[PDB]
Amino acid sequence: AKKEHVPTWLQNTHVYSWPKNKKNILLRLLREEEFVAPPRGPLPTLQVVPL
Amino acid sequence: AEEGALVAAVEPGPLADGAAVRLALAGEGEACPLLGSPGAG
């Protein structure tokens, strides 16, 4: 296949290549992202000090 | 007729004097500014 073959309305979403990205297909069927951001921390300390 | 006239010496009469006026700034100092925030890893 090629890019043009995908219907336009579908092209707006993710497209996976078989068999290269079958892991991504399985993860998507599980609604799981292959890469996940780590949890956020607190804001940095505004350590403004005199000169 | 030597009594015709006389020689006269001119002087500036009402002289006056005064002192110069100079400006100065009273007191001096400097408050420190603030700076800095920590980096992160």
From Swiss-Prot, chain A:
Species in which this protein is naturally found: Homo sapiens (Human)
Assembly, per entry: Interacts with IKBKG/NF-kappa B essential modulator, with CHUK/IKK-alpha and with IKBKB/IKK-beta. Interacts with TRAF6; this interaction is direct. Interacts with IL17RA and IL17RC. Interacts with IL17RB.
Protein purpose: E3 ubiquitin ligase that catalyzes 'Lys-63'-linked polyubiquitination of target protein, enhancing protein-protein interaction and cell signaling. Transfers ubiquitin from E2 ubiquitin-conjugating enzyme UBE2V1-UBE2N to substrate protein. Essential adapter molecule in IL17A-mediated signaling. Upon IL17A stimulation, interacts with IL17RA and IL17RC receptor chains through SEFIR domains and catalyzes 'Lys-63'-linked polyubiquitination of TRAF6, leading to TRAF6-mediated activation of NF-kappa-B and MAPkinase pathways.
Protein name: E3 ubiquitin ligase TRAF3IP2
Disease: Psoriasis 13: A common, chronic inflammatory disease of the skin with multifactorial etiology. It is characterized by red, scaly plaques usually found on the scalp, elbows and knees. These lesions are caused by abnormal keratinocyte proliferation and infiltration of inflammatory cells into the dermis and epidermis. Candidiasis, familial, 8: A primary immunodeficiency disorder with altered immune responses and impaired clearance of fungal infections, selective against Candida. It is characterized by persistent and/or recurrent infections of the skin, nails and mucous membranes caused by organisms of the genus Candida, mainly Candida albicans.
Tissue expr: Widely expressed.
Disulphides: none
Residues of the full protein shown: 524 to 574 of 574
Protein encoded by which gene: TRAF3IP2
Curated annotation (Swiss-Prot), chain B:
Post-translational modification: Glycosylated.
Tissue-level expression: Widely expressed.
PTM-bearing positions, type Phosphoserine: 37
Taxonomic superkingdom: Eukaryota
Clinical condition linked: Immunodeficiency 51: A primary immunodeficiency disorder with altered immune responses and impaired clearance of fungal infections, selective against Candida. It is characterized by persistent and/or recurrent infections of the skin, nails and mucous membranes caused by organisms of the genus Candida, mainly Candida albicans.
Function: Receptor for IL17A and IL17F, major effector cytokines of innate and adaptive immune system involved in antimicrobial host defense and maintenance of tissue integrity. Receptor for IL17A. Receptor for IL17F. Binds to IL17A with higher affinity than to IL17F. Binds IL17A and IL17F homodimers as part of a heterodimeric complex with IL17RC. Also binds heterodimers formed by IL17A and IL17F as part of a heterodimeric complex with IL17RC. (Microbial infection) Receptor for SARS coronavirus-2/SARS-CoV-2 virus protein ORF8, leading to IL17 pathway activation and an increased secretion of pro-inflammatory factors through activating NF-kappa-B signaling pathway.
Subunit structure, as described in the record: Forms heterodimers with IL17RC; the heterodimer binds IL17A and IL17F homodimers as well as the heterodimer formed by IL17A and IL17F. Forms complexes with 2:1 binding stoichiometry: two receptor chains for one interleukin molecule. IL17A homodimer preferentially drives the formation of IL17RA-IL17RC heterodimeric receptor complex, whereas IL17F homodimer forms predominantly complexes with IL17RC homodimer. (Microbial infection) Interacts with SARS coronavirus-2/SARS-CoV-2 virus protein ORF8.
Protein name (database record): Interleukin-17 receptor A
Species: Homo sapiens (Human)
